[PDB]
A paper describes a structure:
It forms homotrimers protruding from the virus surface and, once engaged with the host-cell receptor–human ACE2, undergoes a substantial structural rearrangement to fuse the viral membrane with the host-cell membrane. The S protein is also the primary target of the humoral immune response during infection. A large number of SARS-CoV-2 neutralizing monoclonal antibodies bind S protein, especially its receptor-binding domain (RBD), providing a basis for vaccine development.
The Kappa variant also harbors multiple mutations in the S protein. To uncover the structural mechanism underlying the observed binding property changes, we carried out the cryo-EM analysis of the Kappa S trimer in complex with human ACE2 PD domain. We also focus-refined the stably associated RBD-1-ACE2 region to 3.8-Å resolution. Detailed inspection showed that the original negatively charged E484 could form contact with ACE2 K31. However, the substitution of the E484 with polar but uncharged Gln (Q) could reduce the original constrain, leading to the outward shift of the T470-F490 loop. For the L452R mutation, the hydrophobic to positively charged substitution also reverse the local surface property, with elongated sidechain, thus affecting the binding of MAbs targeting this region.
Numbering used by the authors:
A (entry chain A): 19 to 615
B (entry chain E): 333 to 526
Write the structure that this text describes.
Amino acid sequence: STIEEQAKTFLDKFNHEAEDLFYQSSLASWNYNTNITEENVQNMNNAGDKWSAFLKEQSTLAQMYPLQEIQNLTVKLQLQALQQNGSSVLSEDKSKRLNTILNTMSTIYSTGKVCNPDNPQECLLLEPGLNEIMANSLDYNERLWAWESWRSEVGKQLRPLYEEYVVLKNEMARANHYEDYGDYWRGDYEVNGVDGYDYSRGQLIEDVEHTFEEIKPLYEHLHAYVRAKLMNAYPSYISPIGCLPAHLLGDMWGRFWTNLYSLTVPFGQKPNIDVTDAMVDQAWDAQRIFKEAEKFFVSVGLPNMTQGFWENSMLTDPGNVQKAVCHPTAWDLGKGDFRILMCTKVTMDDFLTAHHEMGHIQYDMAYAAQPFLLRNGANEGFHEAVGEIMSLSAATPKHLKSIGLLSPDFQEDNETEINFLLKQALTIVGTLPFTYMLEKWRWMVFKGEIPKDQWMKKWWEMKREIVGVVEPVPHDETYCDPASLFHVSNDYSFIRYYTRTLYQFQFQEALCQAAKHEGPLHKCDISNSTEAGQKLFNMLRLGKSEPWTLALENVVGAKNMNVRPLLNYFEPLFTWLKDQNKNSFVGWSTDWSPYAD
Amino acid sequence: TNLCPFGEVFNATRFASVYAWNRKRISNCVADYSVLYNSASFSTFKCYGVSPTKLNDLCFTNVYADSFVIRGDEVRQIAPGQTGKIADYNYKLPDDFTGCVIAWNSNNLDSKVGGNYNYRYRLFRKSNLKPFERDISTEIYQAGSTPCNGVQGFNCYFPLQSYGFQPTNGVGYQPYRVVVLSFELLHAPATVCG
Ligand SMILES: *[C@@H]1O[C@H](CO)[C@@H](O)[C@H](O)[C@H]1NC(C)=O
Ligand SMILES: *[C@@H]1O[C@H](CO)[C@@H](O)[C@H](O)[C@H]1NC(C)=O
Ligand SMILES: *[C@@H]1O[C@H](CO)[C@@H](O)[C@H](O)[C@H]1NC(C)=O
Ligand SMILES: *[C@@H]1O[C@H](CO)[C@@H](O)[C@H](O)[C@H]1NC(C)=O
Ligand SMILES: *[C@@H]1O[C@H](CO)[C@@H](O)[C@H](O)[C@H]1NC(C)=O
Ligand SMILES: [Zn+2]
């Protein structure tokens, strides 16, 4: 009778047609990943275009139904993500120019190699080659050699491609009625239609800039300690009052500082917690690993693995018969099919990663009852964050003594907690200023606040001021440094990694308080507590069917994203660093550079 | 001196799609319901209005065997007083229904690699089905006031939709062959007993 009845009829027709094609497209990528052959490429290409042409065909019909006359919110949200036409709005000529530039940068990133002038016949790629040199080498020049050469060759190739990439993505968003293309990425956090929960696309920038102001007290002392320890290993090449060199940060881009934990460890004579030597003597295999992981989610009340899971999933590298990518990915193929692809080795890290990839599966099985278009994370940052809180539960000394890995007589004290937090402080806190820096840079480029010639000039002004990192060698406008990074040239919005941090500690303080924990938060374990699982499962099943501001209020009891749990989690570390930093200079100036003497 | 032929009803290789659901009249024989219950090869076996131990010795003049194939999570939609797509638009049991419900896992047979599309179900119909009504009409569904004229298009949909079954699907998805038995007493004498 009305447009409402027609819409509910269309969206019902769309759901049962989508499961069949979307399952085909994901299963084809599965058969591509586990078994890599030319025959599997066409199977992924055909099934990938059939799904690409399906959403392209449905979007034409979906725009017929106006969103104005539909009062039902759950129906209104389904058409919202469906009626956005994406790249199809551009002309057919620029349509191929966009995918060409995207496919060109993807090959340059993967096939980009560095070649030493000494023996031009031998060259090295980034992975594994350059990633191993940056991490394990203590030499100044060797670390600088991989830092300059990677951005020298790759930077010259991607820059003329990237300048055209900015113009193309703008004309796409301008026809979508967005102020710029940066607003299109921020459109995931957009909330409208509910009184008091409305969260504007532009409120994100004002909120992130506010939340990052309170992390600086934690990060500046985290920087002053790392600069103090590495100063002994590099007396001439690191200034005490200046910013850290870029290539000394432990890897290529300085994203994760975990590699510095070896030199920056607070206490060397205290034993580090590792379950590796305990697992080898117990001779566990891939089967028993996830059974301990499946046993975890049963203790909180979440449902366990399906019987078809263990049969259809490939949990190990199937020998030399077929080649496969070992990058861990949690696959949701729909139709109640869930698979985890991992190359299993015996380590403490894989066991901690084991809960992560299984954490996503616990999240996907929860909203599986939701309709198709509503199957996703509530925002783009929850889906990754739910897997992170599970890894924090398995890294506590309480849980490792529960399943029998670590000896019961292991003696905890003040020196053990500080050693554990600093590892988590390098990974979790160390990546926040870099992420906020990268996003704030993109957002000013797409908006137009930065002219094309000031890109590299404004970049290293953000490097020095925000993150306190100075370039070891100056770069002119010919190089583009950020383009060489994975997420920059692959067209993936990188703000996900900042929000998952602020969300994981809110869940951590909310779920542990539901478990009635006593004492500091980093010693918390959600095992055996059924209250925590029920409070978490309330959000897990909702998916994106409800606004993320509403679903967040259930779990953490707050409508806004706040950093207060973060400083509460590292509160033991922050109190210890202030005493160690009283003899060290806190802060950095942007005027110093290694190449100016 | 004959056993009711449930052998061909349950062990048949091919059943009907839920809209095609096949009715088979059973009369003038003696049925053993204990071999059904005591087999323990059935996933879900429930009776309504009569106990399985009571129907073992008892006499009903008419026994209808309604067999079809539906999805796992949709089996709970077969019962008196239920809603959903299968209940309203496909196969509808009355509230007074006196019969039993039988379901077992067909995944080893019906589902095949790459999916089996021959199993179909009616996703849209203008109204709800009255108890025990088979409507096989393929006529185009009309969502709005726009004339369909038997061609698909905008606000006109083809009501029959197929279930993809692939052996790798999740268990709830995986096909179950459901056989609904009905029992009544009418003016005719009862030739069927224990
Ligand atoms: C992988 O694919 C190749 C060719 O596509 C095939 O010969 C081989 O048997 C496959 N491996 C497995 C384990 O199925
Ligand atoms: C929207 O429609 C769905 C399905 O028809 C229904 O479950 C939901 O309650 C409706 N929402 C409102 C606010 O009426
Ligand atoms: C998963 O849980 C169900 C019920 O909680 C149980 O029947 C099943 O055996 C469990 N899975 C395994 C592999 O034991
Ligand atoms: C959870 O309970 C089981 C059974 O009581 C016990 O074996 C295990 O150690 C407990 N784990 C924790 C972390 O308390
Ligand atoms: C179907 O065949 C099996 C195999 O012998 C048998 O046990 C079963 O009784 C048969 N079905 C019926 C309804 O008799
Ligand atoms: Zn993940």
